[PDB]
């Protein structure tokens, strides 16, 4: 394994340090606004060294964006795909790519067997090819690394089911700025090539200025260079025509010949290609062929040909195709260009370019970072998105937990097709995979289609809980009993984070009566391959609750009142019919753990009673009578773990670690960012704050305080949130209940405030994958500061570091020396001028969840200062999985449980904290005769502070007959494990196996 700390990798291109050294002036560069007059020798081409030029069609097709999946598919989509289908059969020649598989896979199974048959001959022979094969171009900004991979697998098990092809060319020319996640994915699952678009104006001046737009891509940690895959970015403002045939839009726009009730915004229209103009037209395009050029390393030029749902009608395929084979007759036949133009694919381009390559025509530079954020002109940065529509973002992550949970709990058995477990699991992957879409999990979309990605994720997030509570009663009743009726619910999940008892008053009460109903069984799942204790909570209708295992062992547990918070001033009422009962539920790796909750006359052995304490309330049957107070400082404890000092406004402001160690200053603080009044307005996409953020003012806010043995927070009613800190013996968990109702022009925004020695450090991660080095940099303007936050960002000097672990994809910075700020939710009353023709102003309650990890570092293996990753330590990462992915809670529907058994998983093997089972998928329905399980594995690397089992999955289930090292689809084999073990994964590196069963 490579050492991924002590190493620091050697690249032509490291984007922090570029950024470091870039002056970022938006200079007018003429026709080519954010570049230069490009400049040739017209004796670099001869008939030895002729310019090789791929023109490309192309049809950008969004899965949801002004319309939704089904209305883009009647109004725009089918007729693209069958005139591709009819116009690329007729003509041999022509040529068009195709990327979003949800819309192929929604045409193709409503084709005749003959359609099918000629869509199957336009793919073998070349002539239709699939870029990339995900279900969607994927966000790479908000986006999980687990549901990129998720809807790459779905798409390209789709092809090669129905089509026999995985494509190894990649395509994103839309995503808001770009991830190395995704050659991290692609480069694991056998891709060779990728492109990418949509990279800041002055990136691409810079990069032009040296021919850096193609580069081998690999991961900020890579000594090696394994991990590195050739990117093409492409040089312009758009991927459209006017910004694909050459440097000056008003030349190039001539050449898109739809433009003859669309027009030239340069007002010189294309004209028709005659025997007349074809001389001069030619010698116009060839000369913007050749300024594209100028900026590649090689002589093999790509032309990409299209625009947003392009290639709808026949007579758009005619006039495309007709003028552009008149342009390729007569250059081709004319010495003096020493050109070979021609309809090409992506895979041809890439291919004519490594030849290029092996004969030494060019050396490709190396490139480690990121693409973000992302600024398409002047001061218009791309860093709105990371926040927009926070609900939705939200539940991503619950669904994608869902989706992983369903896929593991199902994946133990062969199911009959009856119990319909594949249907329910394919609409759960293609929901979740659905919303990875770059106006999906990105909040771009319009509020109509936003509500169709809720709706399918809400059928998806059903289709999971039923497949796990049928699961579930088949891994814990005994086989001689088991009997199920597919159709029944043997148990109801209990989630106390989605979508939240402030958002929705959902969660089931728990009615026990020693006449009505005495018990009830409860589960709990650990998803994650390692033992894990974590404190559950349930409601029930009595106080006088006691918890037992299954073998009548007795678990200590804490009832606490259940709050909820009203306005007209924002104060917490108390429920005197339901209280929570919380306990530690002790679960095996990838396994299940059965309690019993059971009620008594008075307060049992076991169970202790929360004091509440309400500074500025009857409780039924609940036995501590609430204390009131005026507004004043406190201090709480829970366990050995940290001691939090709150604010009269139940805000945090320090935390001290252990009993002899330093009051740390932690403070909490809301601030709002508004909308200039003058020149560019925020939206969906772009933040374009009116200057620093303002302080919230608070007034006198009620503060409820919860004091237990087991669990206490503090609660406060701040005007747009519920705030709360929930301590449970290790690092606090923070809940934000964000209504920000009416406040037009508004984003709130939660800051810490340290004395930690940060500087202009900060650190973010991609995708929930990688923490990469940030740099505040003055020169740039604040919105330019906002990163991704997809799950954790982290300031740090030479002896502390605090780090903020996100439930929800959010954008965030450190604006200035010891801050961490993250923008909990934003209402836009102004478009932003990017198409989607409205502002944001369909907010909703949504419950965020983080944790606040406060640690010493100074006896850390860290990162030299010139590396440019960060690594969590040990608890950050375990922080970060207690808001992924938790334990499942599921109740017993019925009265009663015969065969019940008490745990699963017993045996499986406890792996190495920085491992992680990321996918258990079964790939054969019940009808296969060899039975089939996929597995990823990912290995984080974690930092060495000075403080198990080996996992092979491969033996997981009995009856293994062979194990094989996998591409991450599970698509193709790349090790026959003779041996059958599977071989442990380095640090940073993810790898998948399929084990085969008799
Ligand atoms: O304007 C940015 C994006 C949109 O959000 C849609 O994805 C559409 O394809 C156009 N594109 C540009
Ligand atoms: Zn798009």
Known sequence: ?????????????????????????????????????????????????????????????????????????????????????????????????????????????????????????????????????????????????????????????????????????????????????????????????????????????????????????????????????????????????????????????????????????????????????????????????????????????????????????????????????????????????????????????????????????AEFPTLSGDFFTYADRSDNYWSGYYTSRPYHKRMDRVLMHYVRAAEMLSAWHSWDGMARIEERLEQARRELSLFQHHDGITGTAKTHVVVDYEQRMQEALKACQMVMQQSVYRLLTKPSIYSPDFSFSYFTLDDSRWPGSGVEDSRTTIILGEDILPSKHVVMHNTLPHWREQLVDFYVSSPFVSVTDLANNPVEAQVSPVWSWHHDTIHPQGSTTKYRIIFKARVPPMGLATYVLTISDSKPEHTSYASNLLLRLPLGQYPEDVKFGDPREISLRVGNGPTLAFSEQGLLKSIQLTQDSPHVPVHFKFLKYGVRSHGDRSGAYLFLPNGPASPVELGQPVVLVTKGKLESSVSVGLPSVVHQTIMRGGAPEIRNLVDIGSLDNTEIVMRLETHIDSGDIFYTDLNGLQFIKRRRLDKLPLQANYYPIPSGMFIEDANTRLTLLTGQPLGGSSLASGELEIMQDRRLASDDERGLGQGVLDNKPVLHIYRLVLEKVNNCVRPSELHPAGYLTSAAHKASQSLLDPLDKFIFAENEWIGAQGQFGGDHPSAREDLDVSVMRRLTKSSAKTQRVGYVLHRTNLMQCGTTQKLDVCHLLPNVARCERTTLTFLQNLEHLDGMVAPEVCPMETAAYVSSHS
């Open 1 to 361: 394994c490579q050492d991924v700390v002590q190493d620091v990798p050697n690249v032509d291109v490291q984007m922090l340090e570029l950024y470091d050294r870039m002056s970022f002036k938006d200079i007018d560069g003429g026709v080519w606004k954010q570049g230069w007059n490009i400049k040739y020798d017209p004796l670099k081409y001869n008939a030895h060294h002729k310019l090789k030029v791929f023109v490309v069609p192309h049809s950008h097709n969004d899965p949801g964006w002004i319309q939704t999946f089904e209305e883009y598919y009647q109004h725009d989509t089918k007729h693209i795909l069958s005139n591709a289908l009819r116009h690329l059969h007729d003509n041999p020649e022509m040529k068009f790519i195709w990327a979003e598989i949800s819309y192929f896979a929604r045409f193709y199974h409503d084709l005749g067997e003959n359609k099918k048959l000629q869509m199957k001959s336009i793919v073998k022979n070349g002539q239709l090819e699939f870029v990339t094969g995900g279900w969607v171009m994927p966000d790479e900004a908000n986006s999980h690394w687990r549901n990129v991979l998720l809807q790459l697998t779905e798409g390209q098990t789709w092809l090669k089911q129905f089509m026999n092809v995985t494509p190894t060319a990649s395509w994103a020319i839309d995503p808001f700025g770009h991830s190395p996640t995704m050659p991290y994915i692609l480069q694991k699952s056998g891709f060779k090539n990728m492109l990418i678009q949509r990279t800041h104006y002055s990136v691409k001046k810079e990069l032009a200025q040296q021919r850096q737009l193609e580069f081998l891509w690999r991961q900020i940690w890579d000594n090696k260079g394994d991990t590195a895959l050739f990117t093409h970015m492409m040089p312009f403002y758009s991927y459209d025509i006017p910004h694909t045939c050459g440097p000056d839009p008003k030349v190039c726009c001539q050449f898109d010949f739809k433009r003859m009730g669309l027009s030239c915004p340069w007002k010189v229209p294309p004209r028709t290609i005659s025997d007349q103009n074809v001389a001069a037209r030619s010698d116009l395009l060839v000369d913007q062929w050749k300024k594209k050029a100028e900026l590649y390393r090689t002589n093999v030029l790509l032309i990409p040909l299209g625009d947003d749902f392009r290639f709808k009608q026949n007579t758009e395929w005619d006039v495309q195709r007709v003028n552009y084979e008149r342009l390729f007759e007569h250059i081709n036949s004319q010495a003096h260009f020493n050109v070979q133009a021609q309809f090409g694919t992506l895979q041809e381009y890439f291919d004519a370019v490594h030849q290029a390559e092996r004969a030494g025509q």
